[PDB]
Design a protein around this nucleic acid. Structure first.
Ligand SMILES: Nc1ncnc2c1ncn2[C@@H]1O[C@H](COP(=O)(O)OP(=O)(O)OP(O)(O)=S)[C@@H](O)[C@H]1O
Ligand SMILES: Nc1ncnc2c1ncn2[C@@H]1O[C@H](COP(=O)(O)OP(=O)(O)OP(O)(O)=S)[C@@H](O)[C@H]1O
Ligand SMILES: Nc1ncnc2c1ncn2[C@@H]1O[C@H](COP(=O)(O)OP(=O)(O)OP(O)(O)=S)[C@@H](O)[C@H]1O
Ligand SMILES: [Mg+2]
Ligand SMILES: [Mg+2]
Ligand SMILES: [Mg+2]
Lengths: 423, 237, 316, 160, 286
DNA sequence: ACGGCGG
DNA sequence: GATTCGTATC
């Protein structure tokens, strides 16, 4: 049929996966096939076409007939009925259950049901359970049709957003992140396919010029399936049809690094910025990206650059923060940051490591402070007929009121600085 | 090749109810075809339940017979349950025949309705005894909601038989053929449907064949021209 | 009341009448004959032949079974996850096609589909790949999720050149025996800006209005692309000429100030021969002017001030 | 009757004769009407230039007494979401025109306020039922309309 | 009062209102007041129109003292009327005498409910008027079928249960008494057909003409491609229909005439789609 | 007359 | 995209 379906691996050695990752997956899987196995779930996450399920199928074609099929799901509570009958696959029915089919997680209700049902699976009191494996493909979700929801699963389709922290942190859940197929494996396999089609490629007179495309494809995509599809399309072609492969999305920190340091592929700042906006406007249009720029522009040279440049960068960021959510604001801010870091960049710089903004922690602390202040206010209102504005609680009482209400206690009420101390 | 006709009221009702239960077990209901019987059956996503209903040639006014798999020749095919459950939903002559299935409906008001549902050829995929009455289990099971109770316990004793849908429970005094020659747990969304197929052709005993907790349990009912079979898995350990 | 517009009257019916993308069109014809058409995603800009090529491919491939073989779904039709769960019965349908032929599901405007629909389309494309094939047609390929693009062969249609527009215009003219001159057709191509549909519409309007396709008659009913007038205004040396353009060719012609500001933003993004610092300063000034326009001050003085600031940051 | 109306509404043109200032577009649309073929039009210009008047007078010289059964006028005062486009406009376009005055007309006044989803869905209603219907789009700001919609519409600019 | 009508058989007007619900449930309603009777007209998307008529004989008193104009037109919303009469029918078992009233342009539509103890009075606000162009040509009928109400209602219910995204109608009368009338549906099941019988109790009369309603010919069929969204608007009216008359001309307008048992007369006009024809012919020759 | 067909 | 650790291989 199709090369990515006709040349599918028949053994693990034909699977395009790294040796160490393969070892980790193998040992984890075998440990999940033990009578009382610490780990109940195996959440494999990664980009598309990284042999996430290919390797699982091959491994369950060996492990299953050793301690005992893959029983794949077919995507409100239909998944409940499926999993209500996916637990009887016990010994003599041990059949690694693979959930590559995700019950619709773009819908709030069945997303919560998916999460709260996999939790019940995690906390099940049954003494014997089948090895549960979930494959989630990390793919940025494009810009919708004006969707004003703009929720978590409306920006990125990732495990973190489908599952809840507890699910992903549960001691009995093992997560093995997957990486794009390296060019070594990609060339090694795209050449095996060519020594199986050297006949047609010879009569086509492309068998001679095969390693050029085998290398260009291996350098353009980490997707094995897309690589094989592009190879099939080029081989069956006649003329000099352009070799185009699928397009992948950059990461958040990848985009930050591109803005700060740049990209080797392009030494043009304008072209790089325009392409980043064109292909990635679902992240370059979120305030967290500008917060990341502010938090990580000091990771250039480990923070050993002029103060004038830092002042210019932060001043521009502040100016663009009052330009509303306009498209020009980000295009100005990122361009200014890149220009500033381009003029000062040289050779000999041991750049630092970037980090995610801590604004979420500050917001959580603000919420905690609010919760603290409210108790003080109502206590006063019921015990001293006292109404105090939250502004005065945050500027005067938060500090004086607990000091007095504790010192008088020193000789129901608050004895500690409202919202914790200032450090 | 195939031409079958149903020309009675209760027979149409049993056909409808069996078709709906097969449709609610699997989206595509599976019908195989034999020169002496008509076999309809379904499957589950996790391969747990197996409900099969067989219609003998005496159940139809005419049963002429002239993909194909030999074992006696046998045609097996798949057709959508939800589509064909509305066709079988007064009727004077219900004719079914055969790349799309052919079914003819002739109303008592001389209205003839024609449908052409598409079908896909496929291949055929073929202790203690309890003979409790169907209605006693019916009244209890119709009082159990699938959403709130999922499993049913079948504890058989020589003194009495008590069934618990779990913890709503009911007890039936010992039953006609309680041959022990125990405890069994299985699902409920299909048991109620299976026990409610039979009581549609009014003119009523269910047979429970189970061996071990890890072995499947078989349900059998008898009709003058209809055969009923259900096999469900039970928790191994 | 019986004539059809030239855009639809002369829509190609065979792959040989689709100008441009020579290599892509040749590949499509080869797929039409050989068969075994892979999953494809056809991107590009408006008016290039992304749907006139997928429909022609489906015609020349399925042929007589083009009624039970081509399940066409587009934005005008509902395409929720429920629809994707019409796309399943069509795939499960068995039709006796010639060897090498497969059913085609033409999902026009796949960039507007919901993500749940795409996540289910993956299931359909995985379980029924041996009987039916999917032909996505879109304007921006990034709107299709990466797992779907992984299973498909991406074919990007480039902008139609002036020669492939002139050749099709000459064909249509010879069929419609209209009168022309070289300068008129050059102006039609110039205003088309790589759009075949816009070129046909402009030619039809010029023929209807006057009859003779010359430069004057074309330009008195079709205006020169305003992005190019914005670019001319932004690249002026002194402020006199820039403000002069802004007034005569943009304000007195009826273009809205907000349109001018948005076009200026895009022009600046794609501007050449300008330093990066200058470009980002101009972007900032254009953003400030956009802010002022959106707040209510849609006046010519704001645009004049923006051009003055741009000149000020150019000359230093 | 028409003596207690504001002068802006009392002096609304009723025929294409009374629309002044815009000569080229009026001449072109008159020739289009006479020739019997009317393409998908798009009228662009500053407010109060005579776009609504022009299209309404054109649809009165194209239909007549059946200007109420052949023309479907939707504007910003009406909901024009994705459901509206998929149902009301689609059913108006699919149905037959009782043969009256050839094709039916759909006037989308103030289309710049329409959401992008509706404009994207209207693309395959404009170019599928072009044999029975012709769409007219009136807008003051062209940046709010999708480029695909601009591609399939003939642009006429209403000068000040 | 320029118009006044009184009745106690409120079930008739209730059925009139429930037969007007299918044509949208929150929109404007046109009421035409003339000496002959009381008529409600509704139009949806310029593609389908209903016209119910309550004759003078349904009211003991029907004055119509208006003299300046022969007919009076008023536009009132239907959601207001529905929401009012819904709570008024709470005690419908009482002997209620409904009284319609209208004093002319600018005056509200009054609807008084007197139980001999309580006299509820409601004044419905009248809106400006935006409905005849959607009428078949009487000299161009291509087929004329008279069908029983119960059979048509059952067929429509079946088509609803099958989904029936699109619908087709057939009208062929062959040389003998071979009156063929069928309602084909394009549904999930595929190509489903509901054939009305040729017997005279269900199909009283089928006559196919050459677009002139005068020349009868056999062997030729008239095909109508209708959207079932519009075709289901007559189901609620056929539910109470004794006999249903179907008429279509070559311009693609289907006029469903429903008569109830005197009762109420319902006229539905439906437009035909642009448009499978050979598939229709091949399925019905088979 | 009772069972089935908001985030 | 950067650093740091760890291989595998020529
Ligand atoms: N050497 C190879 N190793 C692995 N997979 C291969 C190889 N050659 C061909 N393939 C095929 O490439 C495809 C890879 O699919 P997978 O990566 O397992 O699915 P996936 O990771 O979920 O990708 P997405 O996100 O679903 S599109 C399968 O269809 C394989 O059969
Ligand atoms: N390659 C081509 N050769 C000749 N005419 C073409 C070509 N491409 C488009 N056209 C004309 O454009 C009209 C059809 O437009 P389409 O090809 O469907 O546009 P499109 O490429 O699909 O852009 P979108 O996605 O619909 S905005 C007809 O008038 C065709 O004659
Ligand atoms: N060319 C004209 N000749 C005569 N009166 C005109 C002309 N243009 C506009 N008017 C008058 O101005 C009024 C408003 O113009 P309209 O055509 O109704 O609206 P418009 O010009 O389309 O502007 P917008 O975009 O709808 S706000 C009309 O009712 C006329 O009275
Ligand atoms: Mg996979
Ligand atoms: Mg297109
Ligand atoms: Mg207007």
């Amino acid at each position: 049929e199709q090369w990515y379906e006709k040349f599918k691996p028949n053994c693990l050695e034909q699977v395009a996966i790294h040796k160490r990752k393969l070892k980790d997956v193998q040992e984890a899987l075998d440990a999940m096939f033990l009578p009382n196995a610490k780990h109940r779930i195996l959440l494999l996450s990664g980009p598309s076409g990284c042999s996430k399920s290919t390797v699982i199928k091959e491994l369950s074609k060996i492990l299953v007939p050793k301690y005992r099929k893959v029983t794949e799901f077919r995507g409100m509570e239909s998944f409940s009925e499926f999993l209500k009958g996916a637990r009887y696959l016990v010994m003599s029915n041990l059949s690694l259950i693979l959930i590559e089919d995700l019950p619709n997680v773009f819908h709030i209700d069945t997303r919560r049901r998916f999460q709260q049902l996999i939790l019940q699976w995690l906390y099940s009191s049954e003494p014997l359970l089948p090895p549960l494996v979930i494959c989630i493909t990390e793919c940025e979700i494009p810009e919708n049709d004006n969707n004003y929801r703009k929720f978590g699963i409306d920006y990125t389709f990732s495990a973190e957003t489908i599952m809840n922290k507890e699910i992903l942190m549960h001691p009995r859940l093992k997560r093995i992140k997957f990486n794009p197929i390296n060019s070594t494996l990609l060339k090694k396999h795209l050449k095996f396919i060519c020594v199986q089609n050297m006949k047609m490629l010879k009569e086509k007179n492309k068998w001679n010029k095969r390693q050029e495309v085998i290398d260009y494809i291996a350098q353009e995509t980490g997707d094995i399936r897309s690589a094989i599809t592009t190879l099939q399309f080029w081989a069956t072609s006649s003329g000099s049809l352009p070799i185009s492969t699928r397009e992948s999305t950059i990461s958040y920190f990848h985009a930050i690094g591109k803005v700060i340091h740049g990209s080797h592929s392009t030494n043009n700042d304008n072209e790089m910025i325009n392409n980043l906006f064109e292909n990635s406007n679902n992240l370059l249009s979120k305030e967290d990206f500008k917060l990341g720029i502010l938090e990580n522009y000091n990771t250039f040279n480990k923070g050993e650059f002029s103060i004038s440049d830092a002042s210019s960068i932060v001043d521009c960021l502040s100016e663009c923060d009052n330009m509303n959510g306009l498209p020009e604001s980000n295009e100005y801010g990122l361009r200014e940051v890149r220009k500033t870091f381009r003029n000062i960049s040289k050779q000999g710089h041991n750049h630092g490591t970037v980090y995610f903004p801590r604004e979420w922690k500050v917001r959580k602390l603000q919420n905690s402070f609010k919760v603290q202040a409210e108790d003080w206010l109502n206590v006063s209102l019921y015990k001293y007929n006292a109404v105090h504005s939250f502004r005065n609680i945050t500027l005067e009482f938060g500090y004086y009121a607990p000091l007095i209400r504790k010192c008088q206690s020193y000789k129901i009420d608050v004895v500690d600085r409202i919202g914790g101390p200032i450090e | 090749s195939f031409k079958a006709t149903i020309t009675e009221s209760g027979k149409q009702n049993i056909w409808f109810r069996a078709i709906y239960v097969l449709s609610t077990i699997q989206d595509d209901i599976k019908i195989t075809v034999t020169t002496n019987e008509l076999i309809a059956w379904s499957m589950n996503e996790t391969d747990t339940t197996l409900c099969q209903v067989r219609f003998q040639k005496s159940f139809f006014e005419e049963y002429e017979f002239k993909g194909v798999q030999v074992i006696h020749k046998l045609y097996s095919f798949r057709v959508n349950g939800r589509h064909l459950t509305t066709i079988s939903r007064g009727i004077k002559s219900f004719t079914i025949a055969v790349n799309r299935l052919i079914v003819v409906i002739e109303m008592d008001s001389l209205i003839v309705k024609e449908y052409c549902p598409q079908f896909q050829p496929i291949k055929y995929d073929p202790i203690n005894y309890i003979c409790c009455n169907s209605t006693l289990l019916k009244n209890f099971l119709d009082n159990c909601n699938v959403n709130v109770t999922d499993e049913v316990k079948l504890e058989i004793n020589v003194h009495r038989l008590s069934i618990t849908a779990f913890s709503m429970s009911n007890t039936i005094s010992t039953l006609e053929h309680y041959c022990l020659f125990k405890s069994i747990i299985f699902k409920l969304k299909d048991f109620k449907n299976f026990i409610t197929i039979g009581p549609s052709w009014k003119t009523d005993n269910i047979s429970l064949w189970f061996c071990h907790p890890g072995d499947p349990i078989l349900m059998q009912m008898q009709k003058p021209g209809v055969k009923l079979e259900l096999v469900e898995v039970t928790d191994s350990n | 009341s019986l004539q059809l517009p030239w855009v639809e009257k002369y829509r190609p019916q065979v792959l040989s009448d689709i100008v441009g993308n020579k290599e892509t069109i040749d590949r499509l014809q080869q797929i039409a004959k050989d068969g075994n058409m892979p999953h494809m995603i056809i991107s590009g800009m408006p008016g290039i032949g992304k749907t006139t090529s997928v429909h022609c491919l489906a015609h020349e491939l399925l042929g007589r079974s083009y009624a039970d073989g081509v399940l066409e779904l587009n934005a005008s039709d509902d395409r929720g996850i429920d629809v994707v769960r019409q796309i399943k019965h069509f795939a499960q349908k068995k039709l006796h096609l010639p060897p090498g032929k497969h059913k085609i599901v033409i999902l026009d405007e796949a960039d507007s589909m919901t993500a749940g629909a795409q996540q289910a389309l993956r299931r359909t494309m995985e379980l029924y790949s041996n009987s039916t094939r999917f032909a996505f047609a879109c304007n921006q390929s990034n709107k299709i999720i990466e797992p779907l693009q992984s299973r498909c062969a991406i074919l990007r249609y480039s902008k139609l050149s002036d020669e492939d527009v002139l050749k099709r215009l000459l064909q249509i003219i010879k069929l419609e025996d209209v009168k022309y001159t070289n300068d008129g057709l050059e102006a039609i191509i110039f205003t088309a800006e790589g759009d075949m549909r816009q070129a046909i519409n402009n030619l039809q309007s010029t023929v209807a209005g006057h009859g003779l396709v010359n430069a004057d008659n074309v330009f008195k009913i079709v205006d020169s692309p305003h992005p190019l007038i914005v670019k001319k205004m932004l690249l002026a040396s002194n402020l006199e000429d820039s403000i002069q353009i802004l007034r005569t060719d943009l304000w007195k012609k009826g273009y809205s100030s907000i349109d001018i500001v948005t076009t200026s933003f895009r022009v600046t993004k794609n501007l050449a021969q300008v330093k990066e610092s200058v470009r980002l300063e101009m972007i900032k000034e254009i953003g400030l002017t956009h802010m002022r326009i959106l707040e209510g001050v849609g006046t010519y003085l704001q645009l004049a001030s923006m051009l003055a600031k741009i000149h000020k940051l150019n000359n230093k | 009757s028409k003596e207690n109306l504001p002068w802006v509404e009392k002096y609304r043109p009723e025929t294409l004769d009374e629309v002044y200032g815009q000569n080229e577009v009026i001449t072109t649309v008159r020739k289009f009407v006479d020739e019997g073929k009317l393409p998908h039009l798009l009228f662009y210009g500053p407010p109060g230039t005579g776009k609504t008047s022009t299209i309404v007078a054109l649809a009165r010289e194209i239909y007549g007494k059946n200007y109420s059964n052949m023309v479907l006028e939707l504007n910003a005062s009406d909901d024009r979401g994705i459901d509206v486009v998929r149902n009301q406009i689609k059913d108006f376009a699919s149905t037959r025109q009782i043969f009256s005055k050839g094709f039916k007309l759909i006037i989308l006044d103030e289309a710049d306020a329409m959401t992008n989803a509706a404009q994207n869905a209207l693309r395959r209603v404009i170019e599928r039922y072009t044999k029975n219907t012709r769409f007219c789009v009136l807008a003051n700001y062209a940046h709010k309309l999708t480029p695909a919609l601009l591609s399939r519409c003939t642009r006429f600019r209403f000068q000040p | 009062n320029k118009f006044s009508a009184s009745t106690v058989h409120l079930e008739h007007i209730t059925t009139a209102l429930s037969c007007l619900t299918p044509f949208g449930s929150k929109d404007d309603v046109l009421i035409f007041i003339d000496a002959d009777g009381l008529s409600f007209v509704r139009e949806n998307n310029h593609v389908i129109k209903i016209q119910l008529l309550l004759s003078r004989e349904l009211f003991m008193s029907y004055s119509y003292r208006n003299e300046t104009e022969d007919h009076m037109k008023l536009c009132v919303k239907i959601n207001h009327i529905l929401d009012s009469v819904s709570v008024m029918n709470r005690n419908s078992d009482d002997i209620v005498e409904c009284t319609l009233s209208y004093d002319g342009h600018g005056s509200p539509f009054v609807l008084i409910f007197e139980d001999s103890f309580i006299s509820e009075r409601v004044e419905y606000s009248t809106y400006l008027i935006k409905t005849n162009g959607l009428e078949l040509d009487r000299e161009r009928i291509s087929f004329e079928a008279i069908i029983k109400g119960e059979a048509l209602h059952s067929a429509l219910k079946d088509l609803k249960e099958i989904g029936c995204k699109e619908c087709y109608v057939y009208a062929k009368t062959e040389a003998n008494d071979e009156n063929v009338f069928a309602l084909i549906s394009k549904s999930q099941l595929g190509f489903s057909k509901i054939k009305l019988p040729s017997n005279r109790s269900i199909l009283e009369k089928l006559q196919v003409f050459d677009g002139d309603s005068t020349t009868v010919i056999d062997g030729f069929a008239v095909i109508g491609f209708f959207d079932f969204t519009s075709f289901d608007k007559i189901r609620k009216s056929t539910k109470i229909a004794s006999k249903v008359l179907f008429r279509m001309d070559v311009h693609g307008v289907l006029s469903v005439n429903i008569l109830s048992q005197p009762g109420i007369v319902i006229e539905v006009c439906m437009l035909e789609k642009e448009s499978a024809q050979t598939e229709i012919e091949l399925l019905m020759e088979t």
